[PDB]
Amino acid sequence: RSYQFWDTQPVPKLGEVVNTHGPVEPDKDNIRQEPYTLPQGFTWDALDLGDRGVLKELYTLLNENYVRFDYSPEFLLWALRPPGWLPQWHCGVRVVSSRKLVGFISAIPANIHIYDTEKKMVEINFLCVHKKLRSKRVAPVLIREITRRVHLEGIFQAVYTAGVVLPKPVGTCRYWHRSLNPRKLIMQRTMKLYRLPETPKTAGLRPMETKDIPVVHQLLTRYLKQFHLTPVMSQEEVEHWFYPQENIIDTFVVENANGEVTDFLSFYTLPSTSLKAAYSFYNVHTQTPLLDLMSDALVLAKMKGFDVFNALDLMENKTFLEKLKFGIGDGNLQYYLYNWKCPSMGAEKVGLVLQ
Ligand SMILES: C#CCCC1(CCCCCCCCC(=O)SCCNC(=O)CCNC(=O)[C@@H](O)C(C)(C)COP(=O)(O)OP(=O)(O)OC[C@H]2O[C@@H](n3cnc4c(N)ncnc43)[C@H](O)[C@@H]2OP(=O)(O)O)N=N1
Ligand SMILES: [Mg+2]
């Protein structure tokens, strides 16, 4: 196995043992001003997702050519316009004559805590090449050009996930699923096993509100220190990523008999082509047991009509997946850093959830 493009990139070699910490290459004092050359008849673009026509072009490309997942426009705005987003980081390739969008990659900024270091980075998602254009080395140009546009802004490290093995994962996660609506998945013995309570068990559970932004921010910031790869969110970012939006993101806080918010659970919405799936986001416990929190999360997903509840095995999730009758799925989710060498880690030390 030899990686034509990735072996030229500042990332560790597959199977080299890493005992050191830091950048493979130094920050750059001068960066290429010019966009990388594309084949004749194609052009670069910085998509402005605030224009609804542009947003709908992105939406069309992703549903027809991405990983079937049904990313909504509202969902894309949540994922791709967090604080600090830039339109040039919504990097597209268009046919010159028709302006047809045929390629995409995106970067959003994040402060990333990796072992004893915190570095300003970008997260990379939604790399997509039109089906009629696959296997033509278009992906390496998108990666190089988004790298160039990120460098112009003074950032030299990135974090991302992918289902394929590349040099070199800092960690590997397995996807697990919990059947909420067994009928759509498909006998009476099976439907009975997965019956969940109609109402949650934990006292003081309620939707997150505007007033909970500070305490949710504080609870998440102190919970994440026990992991080795985590985001460091401002209060503005906590608002964007957790404030509830129908069919996008759900957050429930635990407010106790004294009125203290001590726990919260969160999951985002991604339907499949329909099949409505919930994805475990961040779940923070300081007084409610984690097994009760997640049990209530399953109940809340069923009440809201989700057919399936998905969770990775990262953070502390192994302590409850089997007990709540999750089933392991096929494939793996790999975590990668770009231009950062460090020792790899077990799933349970990863504290970063990327959609
Ligand atoms: C500061 C700073 C730097 C910031 C930074 C950080 C680096 C970022 C890296 C990209 C991260 C992406 C995260 C995601 O979003 S995960 C979603 C991607 N999946 C899908 O969306 C499913 C639908 N799929 C398609 O649309 C696909 O067909 C894609 C993947 C687009 C087009 O590929 P093609 O099939 O067209 O093949 P190719 O264009 O010929 O190129 C072949 C070379 O690409 C490598 N390849 C392949 N699959 C890769 C992958 N998933 N990720 C990275 N490489 C990948 C191969 O391994 C070859 O490389 P080598 O082995 O070394 O030779 N720079 N940004
Ligand atoms: Mg290609």
UniProtKB/Swiss-Prot annotation:
Query: Membrane topology type, per the record?
Result: Peripheral membrane protein
Q: In which tissues is it expressed?
A: Heart, gut, kidney, liver and placenta.
Consequence of mutating residue 71 to A? Answer: Reduced glycine N-myristoyltransferase activity
Indicate yes or no for the key word Phosphoprotein: yes
Q: Name one GO molecular function term.
A: peptidyl-lysine N6-myristoyltransferase activity
Identify the GO cellular component terms for this protein: cytoplasm; cytosol; plasma membrane
In its UniProt entry, the species of origin is given as Homo sapiens
Task performed by this protein: Adds a myristoyl group to the N-terminal glycine residue of certain cellular and viral proteins. Also able to mediate N-terminal lysine myristoylation of proteins: catalyzes myristoylation of ARF6 on both 'Gly-2' and 'Lys-3'. Lysine myristoylation is required to maintain ARF6 on membranes during the GTPase cycle.
Identify the main location: cytoplasm
A Gene Ontology biological process in which this protein takes part is: N-terminal peptidyl-glycine N-myristoylation
Detail which positions bind tetradecanoyl-CoA: 4-6, 126-129, 135, 137-139
The record's subcellular locations are: Cytoplasm; Cytoplasm, Cytosol; Membrane
Q: Does the UniProt entry include the keyword Acyltransferase?
A: yes
Q: What is this protein called?
A: Glycylpeptide N-tetradecanoyltransferase 1
What changing residue 66 to P does, per the record, is:
Abolished glycine- and lysine-myristoyltransferase activities
**What family name appears in the similarity comment?**
Belongs to the NMT family.
Assigned keywords, A-Z: Acyltransferase, Cytoplasm, Membrane, Phosphoprotein, Transferase
